[PDB]
């Protein structure tokens, strides 16, 4: 339960750094990502993980595939920040830090939203807790870097 | 075979209002969670919380 | 030769000589086990088994001979001519000045333990240094206790105490039995009390001579003697004893050592402390240049109280 | 026939560690210096002080007072003579000097013991009849005194010629020169000779009688220990504390120095030193000092001596607790505590150590000036300076001066010429022998084990049992005292807890960012909030540069371990 | 001979260690070398001695008759019996059998030694929250190896991502176990869990402290040594406690601290090494090792004890199997 925290922190630092790198001169994008990262756990708490992912989906389709998302191809800061947070959260649940690391995800590459629709209630609960935990780490680095 | 005590009484507790037996603030979506037995996840009220309440009333 | 293996159930206390009475001086710090403590544990078992003939009740020594002891995880204290330099412990060989053997200045000694294999290479003169990670320290475990009142369940006045235990995996003891039937009696016991605070160690016993006692070092003038257990007696008498037992005179010798080992103990027969004796500490090395070539023995017993496990020296060579 | 002669006296640290009260600690170190002085007297008598290369005697308070007969003040109370000496003597006198030095020290110790025996009986240290004095002077006890210290003396001719490359290679390091030509190498080789002679002499002690041991050192037979049982032996001694001959000398030694110099250390016990914290005792005495001594004598006249408490631990209420006159004192003490604060119960042990004959003399003079004058000036009356013999220091300090004194001494040493140090903060109740051994372990096994050394090792051993250790570079002390972080922390435990508990979960690549976060979370108008966060983060980053550690994580752990020590409200009330 | 004491916690346990290094104000006792939770032999012995002493004074000790300690004291100490009994009432000494088994009270320490050596209670099963089956009884190879060694002398390979677990912990078809918030993949294994249960049955019997041992088998999870150590150090209860200044109705000055607890549903074991009773002129029914062992088993088997502190706030209660 300690090594998993380090893995989360490593991922969180990486994705926030990518945000700050690509949009260094764009404070609006950085600020939007930060706000959404803070609001995200709340949306999950009050609506569940499934609905939250669906809510992100509406901010972007043919199929539910986080891989196919391209955050940089959007017009405004709101959609760019949403697409990034959505992909980050989905990537973590599906891939972790890669298959060369301790944590390689929970869903084995499957999109978390479709995963929720197919697997058991237990599978959904662990995905919910894990989602809250990674967002909690993203919030830390967001406040300190963005 | 429990000779350190001689008698025992069961204290039944029925909540008529919501109850927040606290464990303190956390860096989490739930800032102030209630007391829980960690390895079962069951809500509890620690004996020291209940003793403080009983003592103060008595 | 019989090999006894002690396996501590949990912790061990080999208390230093200092007052340790409830309600007064209340701090017990363990030292590295002295061989007489191990001898005492064995003698006490025989004392209770009814073999009071081999015990030596009220005597300094028993009838049998404790060859020596060693702790294990088998490890030995760093020879005192091994000096830490940066991240390496370097072996320092004897020099000569004014026709006298000396140890050249190369830094201060730092305490620690090495495996039996590292010691073997040292004794063969093939060891140059040891990486600091291969130098072991003995783990201590500090416990703080109290005494409660019978009824009120509160601490009695002044009844708090501290013990610094050792966390040791194994203690080995080797015994030469002149027919007392120690191997059979030890086999009948699973455990025994060893050291203080009524701690016990499991007992296993095997009829075998450890390989370190069977080494072939060859013949040379330049022999060294690593003391694996404390050695009691004047250096002059020990060197003279060495000359007699190997039938060879000595041109010069150098004792590389440290703080003398203070040895007293507790007399269970008379229920009072034993008299204080002083010994050459384990890890000390006696470098010897014999007048003629000698066959360096794998081990040799020197000094006083041999039967209690003292004076176990391991043979070696130097250049 | 010029001959380089080396003197070494052992043991030092074991003897010094055999202490129960602070007076034992001072007497041990001071007596050791006195033994070297008695030894050097033999050299000086024949060849004068200028033939003593090390240490520099012309500045030594012992030499000034006892040899030149000058009126030396309280600086005589500091042990300044080390346990090793180097001199140049005539070759024909070398063997005679060796014999005479050994004899002076035996006689001096025997004389001290005879006086100690007389003193002990007359002042009730031993509750025995005066007829039993002969029993105390029997041979078994005299052997212990006579044999305890080993004085090794070796020498080498400076005039003798030898092939330099042959003598240095054989030792383990025109081609034919006198030995004085390679004097620097000769000094080191002579140290080896001396170490050889140390082990030739120190393992020749006589076995002792069966019986109960001294309660101070635990290793030697206590006087009357062979003729009584434990309970009865204890009742025969003051404070139920049986003593061997060496520790009897130790207890007598302060009154001997008192009669010899008129001087006595200002701070008698570790409690006296502890209560220097924030001038607590001074503030109390002005406000409540008269009343307390009155109530103290009302309980017992034995509690008051010279209009003062016989023991400074009587400032603690717990001392009185562990009948109606006693309750009056405790209530009074507790009332004062609520007003001026609880009394400090922790103190600090500070130990420090360094990491052509004419040039060597200059070095010795510099070391003499540093140890005798500079270290004393730093410590002054802020605590008790027990020993300063060159590159090594032993002081007892209140916890609020420990870091400052240590840093100042280090800087002073730098101006004269690297020092490592151990500081152990410890409860006044903790056994002194253990505290001292822990303090030296901090110095020897922690600070000096750091690559490049020059390290301060700070240990805090709580009364409850916990033992926190932090390894820092000297510059950390400076940065911290000038830092906003310090003023903010002392204006807390939550900030420190979170960091220590979670630092192992931090990403290796993002440590700095996590530090930024915790500062944001724990440090807070919004104008001042932004400034304080930037400043404190910068200070933390500055402090981390001077923390000893393998990686950034261990540096963070080391730093916040340091912060946990100095913010401990129980240690710094 | 020796008696193995199994200890099963039914309420959280605080065996206090002052010397333990921790960020917690009041941490529990732990082993230096392994970092595992432990109950010191001296803590356990004190508990055992206090219970035994109370029973003896209350004439509830059975040796198969009622032990009358004052009667036995007189037929043992004879002329010195009355003063001894006086010391017992004065709480300077303990009753006869208590001192035979555990040694004299400190006042009479030098007279003789205690017959028993009470060993540390070592951890065996540590409860960890499981997504399936509520919680798992977690152990490790190093623990099993220690148990086997202790039992054999008195008479497994896993990666950090793997677990050998019973069926009730395993997610259907996924071959996974979820302990708290981490996922371990199930390593196929046939007899290791079964072997462990058999060992437990050989030491404590068919009933596992009030339940069939077969039920326990389905909820045992064996994890790697590093993972087990992690759980025993970071999954113990860390509870904030306060003191309320009722004058103000707010938390008093200096009235906040943190305390660690070993959870309920923890299994530990202590080997009680019994030597020969050492007191002179022993009564016949307790004059040797086997007789001391027998009294120990009957007195403590199926007993309830309180270990550690915080008794009055409901902590430290364990079931005992001997
Ligand atoms: Mg004891
Ligand atoms: Zn002494």
UniProtKB/Swiss-Prot annotation, chain A:
Checking Pfam families in the record gives: Cas_Cmr5
| GO biological process, alphabetically ordered | defense response to virus
InterPro entries found in the cross-reference section:
AF1862-like_dom_sf, CRISPR-assoc_prot_Cmr5
Q: Which key words tag this protein in UniProt?
A: Antiviral defense, Cytoplasm
For the keyword Endoplasmic reticulum, the answer is no
Question: Where does it reside?
Answer: Cytoplasm
> What SUPFAM superfamilies does UniProt report for this protein, alphabetically?
AF1862-like (SSF158568)
Top-level taxonomic group: Archaea
Keyword Cytoplasm included in the entry's annotation: yes
GO CC aspect terms: cytoplasm
In terms of NCBIfam families, this protein maps to: cas_Cmr5
As for family, the record states:
Belongs to the CRISPR system Cmr5 family.
**Know the name of this protein?**
CRISPR system Cmr subunit Cmr5
Q: Can you name the source organism?
A: Archaeoglobus fulgidus (strain ATCC 49558 / DSM 4304 / JCM 9628 / NBRC 100126 / VC-16)
Curated annotation (Swiss-Prot), chain C:
One of the GO BP terms on file: defense response to virus
Q: Which UniProt keywords apply?
A: Antiviral defense, Cytoplasm, Nucleotide-binding, RNA-binding
- Write out the annotated subcellular location: Cytoplasm
Gene3D superfamilies assigned: 2.60.40.4350, 3.30.70.2940
Stated consequence of mutating residue 310 to A: Still cleaves target RNA when assembled in the Cmr complex
Q: Which GO terms describe its molecular function?
A: nucleotide binding; RNA binding
Which cellular component terms (GO) are annotated to the entry?
Answer: cytoplasm
Q: Describe the effect of residue 197 to Q.
A: Still cleaves target RNA when assembled in the Cmr complex
The superkingdom of the source organism is Archaea
Effect of substituting residue 141 to Q? Still cleaves target RNA when assembled in the Cmr complex
The answer to keyword Transcription applying to this record is no
Where does the UniProt entry say this protein principally localizes? cytoplasm
Q: What does this protein do?
A: CRISPR (clustered regularly interspaced short palindromic repeat), is an adaptive immune system that provides protection against mobile genetic elements (viruses, transposable elements and conjugative plasmids). CRISPR clusters contain sequences complementary to antecedent mobile elements and target invading nucleic acids. CRISPR clusters are transcribed and processed into CRISPR RNA (crRNA), formerly called psiRNA (prokaryotic silencing) in this organism.
Its subunit composition reads: Part of the type III-B Cmr ribonucleoprotein (RNP) complex, an elongated RNP with Cmr2 and Cmr3 as the base, with Cmr4 and Cmr5 forming a helical core along the mature crRNA (39 or 45 nt in length), while the complex is capped by Cmr6 and Cmr1. The 5' end of the crRNA is bound to Cmr2 and Cmr3, while Cmr6 and a Cmr1 subunit (Cmr1-1 or Cmr1-2) cap the 3' end of the crRNA.
Q: Which family does it belong to?
A: Belongs to the CRISPR system Cmr3 family.
- By what name is this protein known? CRISPR system Cmr subunit Cmr3
Its gene name is: cmr3
Swiss-Prot record, chain D:
Does the entry feature the keyword Cytoplasm, yes or no? yes
Residue ranges occupied by any GGDEF domain in the UniProt entry = 345-461
What's the domain of life for this entry? Archaea
Q: Care to name a GO molecular-function term for this sequence?
A: nucleotide binding
What outcome is documented for mutating residue 29 to A in this protein? Answer: No effect on pre-crRNA cleavage
Q: Which residues bind Mn(2+) 3?
A: 353, 391-392
Its needed co-factors are:
Ca(2+); Mn(2+); Zn(2+)
Q: Which GO terms describe its biological process?
A: defense response to virus
> Per the record's keyword annotation, is Transmembrane helix included, yes or no?
no
UniProt keywords, alphabetically: Antiviral defense, Cytoplasm, Manganese, Metal-binding, Nucleotide-binding, RNA-binding, Zinc
Annotated binding of Mn(2+) 4, by residue: 374, 412
Major subcellular location class: cytoplasm
Described function: CRISPR (clustered regularly interspaced short palindromic repeat), is an adaptive immune system that provides protection against mobile genetic elements (viruses, transposable elements and conjugative plasmids). CRISPR clusters contain sequences complementary to antecedent mobile elements and target invading nucleic acids. CRISPR clusters are transcribed and processed into CRISPR RNA (crRNA), formerly called psiRNA (prokaryotic silencing) in this organism.
Assembly mode: Part of the type III-B Cmr ribonucleoprotein (RNP) complex, an elongated RNP with Cmr2 and Cmr3 as the base, with Cmr4 and Cmr5 forming a helical core along the mature crRNA (39 or 45 nt in length), while the complex is capped by Cmr6 and Cmr1. The 5' end of the crRNA is bound to Cmr2 and Cmr3, while Cmr6 and a Cmr1 subunit (Cmr1-1 or Cmr1-2) cap the 3' end of the crRNA.
Q: What is this protein called?
A: CRISPR system Cmr subunit Cmr2
Lineage of this protein's species?
Archaea, Methanobacteriati, Methanobacteriota, Thermococci, Thermococcales
């Amino acid at each position: 339960i300690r090594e998993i925290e380090q893995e989360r922190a490593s991922f969180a630092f990486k994705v926030v750094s990518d945000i700050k790198d690509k949009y260094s001169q764009n404070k609006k994008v950085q600020g939007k990502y930060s706000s959404y990262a803070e609001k995200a756990p709340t949306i999950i708490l009050n609506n569940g993980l499934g609905a939250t992912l669906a809510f992100f989906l509406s901010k972007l389709i043919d199929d539910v595939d986080y891989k196919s998302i391209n955050p940089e191809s959007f017009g405004n800061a709101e959609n760019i920040a949403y697409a990034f947070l959505y992909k980050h959260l989905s990537t973590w649940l599906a891939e972790g830090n890669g298959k060369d690391s301790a944590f390689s995800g929970l869903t084995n590459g499957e999109d978390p939203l479709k995963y929720i629709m197919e697997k058991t209630a237990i599978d959904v609960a662990i995905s919910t807790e894990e989602a809250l935990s990674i967002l909690n780490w993203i919030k830390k680095f967001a406040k300190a870097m963005l | 075979m429990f000779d350190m005590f001689e008698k025992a009484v069961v204290f039944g507790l029925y909540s008529i209002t919501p109850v927040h037996a606290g464990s303190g603030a956390e860096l989490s979506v739930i800032d102030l969670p209630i007391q829980r037995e960690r390895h079962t996840g069951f809500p509890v009220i620690w004996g020291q919380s209940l003793k403080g309440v009983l003592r103060s009333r008595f | 030769m019989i090999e006894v293996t002690f396996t501590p159930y949990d912790v061990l206390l080999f208390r230093e000589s200092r007052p340790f009475d409830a309600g007064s001086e209340s701090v017990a710090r363990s030292i590295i086990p002295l061989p007489q403590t191990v001898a005492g544990a064995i003698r006490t078992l025989l004392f209770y088994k009814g073999l009071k003939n081999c015990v030596g009740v009220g005597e300094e020594e028993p009838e049998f001979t404790l060859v020596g002891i060693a702790i294990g995880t088998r490890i030995y204290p760093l020879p005192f001519n091994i000096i830490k330099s940066e991240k390496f412990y370097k072996v320092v060989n004897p020099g000569r000045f004014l026709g006298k053997l000396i140890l050249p200045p190369k830094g201060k000694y730092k305490s620690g333990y090495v495996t039996e294999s590292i010691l073997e290479k040292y004794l063969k003169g093939e060891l140059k240094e040891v990486e600091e990670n291969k130098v072991i320290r003995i783990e201590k475990e500090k416990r703080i206790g109290i005494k409660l009142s019978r009824e009120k369940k509160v601490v009695e006045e002044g009844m708090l105490y501290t013990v610094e235990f050792l966390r040791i995996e194994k203690i080995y003891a080797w015994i030469e039995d002149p027919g007392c039937g120690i191997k059979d009696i030890l086999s009948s016991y699973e455990f025994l009390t060893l050291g203080g605070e009524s701690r016990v160690a499991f007992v296993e016993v095997d009829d075998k001579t450890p390989d370190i006692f069977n080494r072939e070092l060859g013949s040379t003038k330049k022999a060294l003697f690593y003391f694996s257990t404390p050695t009691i007696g004047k250096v002059g008498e020990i060197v003279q004893e060495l000359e007699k037992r190997l039938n060879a005179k000595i041109d010069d010798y150098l004792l590389v050592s440290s703080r003398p080992t203070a040895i007293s103990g507790w007399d269970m027969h008379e229920k009072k402390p034993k008299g204080t004796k002083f010994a050459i500490p384990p890890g000390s090395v006696l470098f010897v240049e014999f007048k003629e070539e000698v066959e360096v023995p794998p081990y040799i017993k020197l000094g006083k109280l041999k039967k209690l496990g003292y004076g176990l020296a391991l043979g070696g060579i130097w250049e | 026939d010029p001959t380089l002669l080396r003197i070494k006296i052992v043991p030092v640290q074991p003897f010094i560690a055999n202490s129960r009260k602070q007076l034992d600690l001072w007497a041990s170190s001071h007596l050791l210096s006195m033994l070297m002085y008695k030894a050097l007297e033999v050299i000086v008598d024949k060849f004068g002080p200028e033939h003593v290369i090390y240490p520099s005697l012309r500045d030594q308070p012992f030499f000034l007072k006892f040899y030149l007969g000058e009126n030396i003040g309280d600086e005589i109370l500091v042990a300044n003579l080390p346990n090793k000496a180097l001199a140049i003597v005539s070759g024909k006198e070398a063997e005679k000097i060796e014999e005479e030095i050994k004899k002076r020290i035996r006689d001096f110790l025997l004389q001290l013991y005879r006086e100690a025996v007389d003193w002990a009986v007359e002042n009730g240290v031993v509750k025995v009849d005066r007829s039993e004095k002969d029993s105390m002077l029997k041979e078994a006890y005299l052997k212990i005194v006579r044999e305890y210290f080993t004085v090794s003396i070796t020498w080498v001719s400076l005039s003798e010629k030898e092939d330099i490359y042959q003598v240095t290679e054989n030792a383990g390091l025109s081609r034919v020169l006198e030995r004085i030509a390679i004097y620097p190498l000769l000094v080191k080789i002579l140290d080896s000779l001396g170490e050889r002679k140390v082990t030739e002499e120190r393992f020749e002690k006589s076995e002792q009688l069966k019986g109960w041991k001294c309660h101070v050192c635990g290793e030697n037979l206590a006087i009357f220990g062979d003729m009584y049982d434990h309970d009865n032996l204890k009742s025969l001694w003051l404070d139920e504390e049986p003593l061997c001959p060496m520790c009897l000398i130790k207890r007598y030694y302060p009154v001997w120095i008192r009669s010899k110099t008129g001087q006595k250390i200002r701070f008698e016990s570790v409690v006296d030193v502890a209560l220097l914290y924030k001038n607590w005792r001074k503030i109390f005495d002005e406000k409540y000092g008269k009343d307390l001594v009155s109530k103290a004598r009302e309980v017992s006249e034995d509690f008051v001596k010279d209009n003062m408490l016989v023991d400074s631990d009587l400032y603690y209420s717990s001392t009185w607790e562990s009948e109606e006159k006693v309750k009056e004192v405790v209530d009074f003490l507790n009332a004062a505590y609520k007003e001026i604060g609880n009394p400090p119960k922790y103190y600090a042990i500070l130990v420090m150590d360094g990491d052509t004959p004419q040039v060597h003399v200059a070095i010795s003079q510099a070391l003499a000036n540093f140890s005798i004058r500079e270290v004393r000036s730093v410590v002054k009356d802020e605590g008790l300076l027990i020993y300063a013999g060159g590159d090594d220091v032993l002081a007892i300090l209140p916890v609020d001066k420990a870091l400052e004194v240590a840093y100042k001494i280090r800087k002073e040493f730098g101006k004269s010429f690297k020092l490592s140090a151990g500081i152990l903060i410890v409860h006044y109740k903790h056994p002194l022998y253990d505290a001292l051994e822990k303090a030296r372990d901090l110095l020897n096994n922690k600070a000096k084990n750091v690559p490049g050394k020059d390290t301060l090792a700070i240990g805090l051993l709580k009364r409850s049992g916990s033992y926190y250790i932090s390894l820092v570079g000297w510059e950390l002390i400076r940065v911290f005292y000038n830092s906003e972080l310090r003023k903010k922390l002392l204006e807390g435990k939550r900030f420190i807890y979170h960091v220590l508990r979670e630092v192992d979960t931090w990403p290796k690549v993002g440590i700095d960012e996590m530090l930024k976060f915790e500062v944001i979370r724990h440090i807070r108008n919004k104008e001042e909030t932004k400034e304080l966060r930037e400043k404190i983060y910068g200070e933390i980053k500055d402090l981390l540069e001077h923390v000893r550690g393998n990686n950034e994580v261990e540096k963070v752990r080391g730093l916040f371990t340091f912060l946990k020590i100095i913010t401990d409200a129980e240690v710094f009330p | 001979k020796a008696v193995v004491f199994g200890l099963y916690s039914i309420t959280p346990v605080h065996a206090g260690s002052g010397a333990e290094l921790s960020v917690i104000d009041l941490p529990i006792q732990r082993e230096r070398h392994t970092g595992f939770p432990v109950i010191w032999g001296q803590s356990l012995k004190g508990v055992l001695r206090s219970r035994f002493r109370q029973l003896e004074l209350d004439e509830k000790i059975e040796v198969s008759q009622k032990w009358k300690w004052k009667e036995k004291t007189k037929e043992v100490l004879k002329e010195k019996a009355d003063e001894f009994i006086k010391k017992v009432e004065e709480r300077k000494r303990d009753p006869l059998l208590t001192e035979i088994v555990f040694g004299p009270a400190t006042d009479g320490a030098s007279e003789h030694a205690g017959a028993v050596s009470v060993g540390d209670a070592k951890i065996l099963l540590f409860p960890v929250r499981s997504a399936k089956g509520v919680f798992a009884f977690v152990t490790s190879p190093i623990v099993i190896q220690r148990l086997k060694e202790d039992f054999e002398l008195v008479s497994v390979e896993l990666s950090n991502n793997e677990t050998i677990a019973g069926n009730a912990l395993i997610l259907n078809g996924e071959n996974k176990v979820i302990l708290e918030d981490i996922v371990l993949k199930v390593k196929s294994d046939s007899n290791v869990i079964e072997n462990l249960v058999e060992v437990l049955k050989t030491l404590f019997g068919d009933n596992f402290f009030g339940k069939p041992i077969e039920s326990i088998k389905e909820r045992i999870a064996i994890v790697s040594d590093d993972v087990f150590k992690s759980f025993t150090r970071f999954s113990t209860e860390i509870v904030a406690r306060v003191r309320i200044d009722a004058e103000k109705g707010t938390v008093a000055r200096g009235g906040l601290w943190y305390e660690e607890f070993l959870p309920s549903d923890t299994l530990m074991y202590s080997l009680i090494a019994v030597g020969s009773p050492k007191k002179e002129n022993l009564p016949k029914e307790v004059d040797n090792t086997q007789k001391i062992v027998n009294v120990l088993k009957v007195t403590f088997n199926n007993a309830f004890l309180q270990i550690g502190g915080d008794e009055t706030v409901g902590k430290g209660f364990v079931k005992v199997r001997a």
